[PDB]
Design a protein around this motif. Structure first.
Motif, PDB file in Angstrom:
ATOM      1  N   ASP A  36       3.178  -5.229   4.990  1.00  0.00           N
ATOM      2  CA  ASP A  36       2.264  -5.902   4.079  1.00  0.00           C
ATOM      3  C   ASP A  36       2.912  -6.354   2.776  1.00  0.00           C
ATOM      4  OD1 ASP A  36       2.434  -3.084   3.509  1.00  0.00           O
ATOM      5  OD2 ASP A  36       0.701  -3.249   2.184  1.00  0.00           O
ATOM      6  N   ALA A  59      -4.856   0.836   2.903  1.00  0.00           N
ATOM      7  CA  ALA A  59      -4.956   1.707   1.733  1.00  0.00           C
ATOM      8  C   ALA A  59      -5.530   3.083   2.044  1.00  0.00           C
ATOM      9  CB  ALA A  59      -5.696   0.983   0.599  1.00  0.00           C
ATOM     10  N   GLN A  96     -10.138  -4.739  -4.904  1.00  0.00           N
ATOM     11  CA  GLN A  96     -11.475  -5.292  -4.721  1.00  0.00           C
ATOM     12  C   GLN A  96     -11.454  -6.570  -3.895  1.00  0.00           C
ATOM     13  OE1 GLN A  96     -12.305  -5.605  -8.858  1.00  0.00           O
ATOM     14  NE2 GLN A  96     -13.414  -3.651  -8.968  1.00  0.00           N
ATOM     15  N   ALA A  98       0.821  -1.216   0.000  1.00  0.00           N
ATOM     16  CA  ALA A  98       0.000   0.000   0.000  1.00  0.00           C
ATOM     17  C   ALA A  98       0.860   1.274   0.000  1.00  0.00           C
ATOM     18  CB  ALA A  98      -0.986  -0.019   1.166  1.00  0.00           C
ATOM     19  N   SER A 114      -2.787  -4.811   3.018  1.00  0.00           N
ATOM     20  CA  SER A 114      -2.674  -3.667   2.115  1.00  0.00           C
ATOM     21  C   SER A 114      -4.018  -2.984   1.936  1.00  0.00           C
ATOM     22  CB  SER A 114      -2.164  -4.107   0.741  1.00  0.00           C
ATOM     23  OG  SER A 114      -0.939  -4.802   0.838  1.00  0.00           O
ATOM     24  N   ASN A 115      -5.093  -3.769   1.799  1.00  0.00           N
ATOM     25  CA  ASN A 115      -6.408  -3.161   1.626  1.00  0.00           C
ATOM     26  C   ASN A 115      -6.842  -2.431   2.886  1.00  0.00           C
ATOM     27  OD1 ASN A 115      -6.676  -3.970  -1.024  1.00  0.00           O
ATOM     28  ND2 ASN A 115      -7.594  -5.943  -0.471  1.00  0.00           N
ATOM     29  N   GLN A 116      -6.503  -2.978   4.053  1.00  0.00           N
ATOM     30  CA  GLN A 116      -6.821  -2.300   5.303  1.00  0.00           C
ATOM     31  C   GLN A 116      -6.075  -0.974   5.411  1.00  0.00           C
ATOM     32  OE1 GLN A 116      -5.401  -2.674   9.746  1.00  0.00           O
ATOM     33  NE2 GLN A 116      -6.358  -4.607   9.123  1.00  0.00           N
ATOM     34  N   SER A 155      -9.124  -9.402  -1.308  1.00  0.00           N
ATOM     35  CA  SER A 155      -8.054  -9.517  -0.329  1.00  0.00           C
ATOM     36  C   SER A 155      -7.427 -10.903  -0.372  1.00  0.00           C
ATOM     37  CB  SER A 155      -8.566  -9.228   1.084  1.00  0.00           C
ATOM     38  OG  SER A 155      -8.933  -7.867   1.240  1.00  0.00           O
ATOM     39  N   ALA A 177      -8.329   0.838  -2.073  1.00  0.00           N
ATOM     40  CA  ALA A 177      -8.172  -0.597  -1.843  1.00  0.00           C
ATOM     41  C   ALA A 177      -8.454  -1.397  -3.113  1.00  0.00           C
ATOM     42  CB  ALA A 177      -9.124  -1.074  -0.746  1.00  0.00           C
TER      43      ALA A 177
END
Ligand SMILES: Cc1cc2oc(=O)cc(CP(=O)(O)O)c2cc1C
Ligand SMILES: [Zn+2]
Ligand SMILES: [Zn+2]
Length: 229
Positions: free
Chosen positions: A151, A108, A117, A80, A104-106, A119, A115
Motif C-alpha cells: 500500500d 489498518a 477518514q 499502514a 491502507s485503510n483496509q 480513502s 483508519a
C-alpha cells in the motif's frame, strides 16, 4: 538546522516545508527515527505522516501552532505501519481531515492502526484520482507499485525540489532495505524506479529513516531491491 521540540526534531527543508522526526525504541534495534513532512500552503498547513504515537503527533500539532499558527487542513499518511499512521487518533481529536490509500485503510485494523477518514484511489498509471484528494494544494500523490508494503504511497511537493518516498526509499549509503516483513520483494525494484520517474525534477529525496538525500537514494535503493529477485 535541527530544532528540538520536546522529544521530536523539526528541520526546515524549504521556505514552506519542514521535516518532522519522532523516535520509538524498537527492542533489538535502538531508538528508530521516522520522518514526515509539514507544508504551509498559503493560510493552511498540510501534514504528511503521523509520528509513531498519538502523544508525539499531538506534539507535532503543538509545534505547528507555535511556529506557523495556521490551521492544519489535512493529513495524508503513506502506509499502514505505526511510524506513518500510529498517531491517527491525535489528528482526529484535533479535527483534521485524514487521507490514506484505500488499501491502507483496509489494512489498518489488522495492523493495529486507526483508519484515515478518507480513502485515496489511484489510476492505472499510479497517480492519485484527484476527486479522492480534494484540496491537496501542492501535494502530488503517487502510488509507485508494491515495495516496502503493498500500500505504500509517495508525495511530491509542487513548487519545490522535494519528493517524499516514505519507507520505500533508503538513503544512498544504506546497507539494507530495512523491514521487509510486509514487502513485495518481486516488485520492489520497479516501484522504487517508478517513484523516481514520477518526480523527475525532485533533487531532494526525503524518506522515513534517513536525512534527506540526493537522487542517488533512488538509484541505490533500486539496486538493493534487485537482489530480492
Ligand atoms: C526493525 C523494524 C521492524 C518493524 O516491524 C514492523 O512490523 C513494522 C515496522 C515499521 P516500518 O519502518 O517498516 O514502517 C518496523 C520498523 C523497524 C525499524
Ligand atoms: Zn512500513
Ligand atoms: Zn519504515
Amino acid at each position: 538546522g535541527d530544532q528540538r521540540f520536546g522529544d521530536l526534531v523539526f528541520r526546515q527543508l524549504a521556505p514552506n516545508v519542514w521535516q518532522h522526526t519522532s523516535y520509538l525504541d524498537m527492542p533489538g534495534f535502538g531508538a528508530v527515527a521516522s520522518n514526515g513532512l509539514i507544508v504551509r500552503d498559503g493560510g493552511r498547513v498540510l501534514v504528511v505522516d503521523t509520528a509513531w504515537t498519538d502523544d508525539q503527533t499531538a506534539q507535532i500539532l503543538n509545534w505547528i501552532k507555535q511556529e506557523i499558527n495556521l490551521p492544519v487542513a489535512l493529513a495524508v499518511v503513506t502506509h499502514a505501519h505505526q511510524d506513518k499512521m500510529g498517531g491517527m487518533d491525535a489528528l482526529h481529536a484535533a479535527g483534521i481531515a485524514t487521507y490514506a490509500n484505500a488499501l491502507s485503510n483496509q489494512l489498518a485494523p489488522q495492523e493495529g492502526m486507526v483508519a484515515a477518514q478518507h480513502s485515496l484511489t489511484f489510476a492505472a498509471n499510479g497517480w492519485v484520482e484527484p476527486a479522492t484528494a480534494p484540496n491537496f494544494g501542492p501535494l502530488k500523490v503517487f502510488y509507485p507499485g508494491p515495495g516496502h508494503t503493498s500500500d505504500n504511497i509517495t508525495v511530491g511537493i509542487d513548487g519545490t525540489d522535494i519528493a517524499f518516498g516514505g519507507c520505500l526509499i533508503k538513503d544512498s549509503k544504506a546497507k539494507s532495505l530495512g523491514n521487509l516483513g510486509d514487502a513485495d520483494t518481486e516488485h520492489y525494484a520497479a516501484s522504487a524506479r517508478a517513484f523516481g520517474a514520477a518526480f523527475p525534477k525532485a533533487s531532494m529525496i526525503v524518506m522515513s529513516h534517513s536525512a534527506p538525500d540526493s537522487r542517488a537514494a533512488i538509484t541505490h535503493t533500486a539496486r538493493m531491491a534487485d537482489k530480492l529477485r
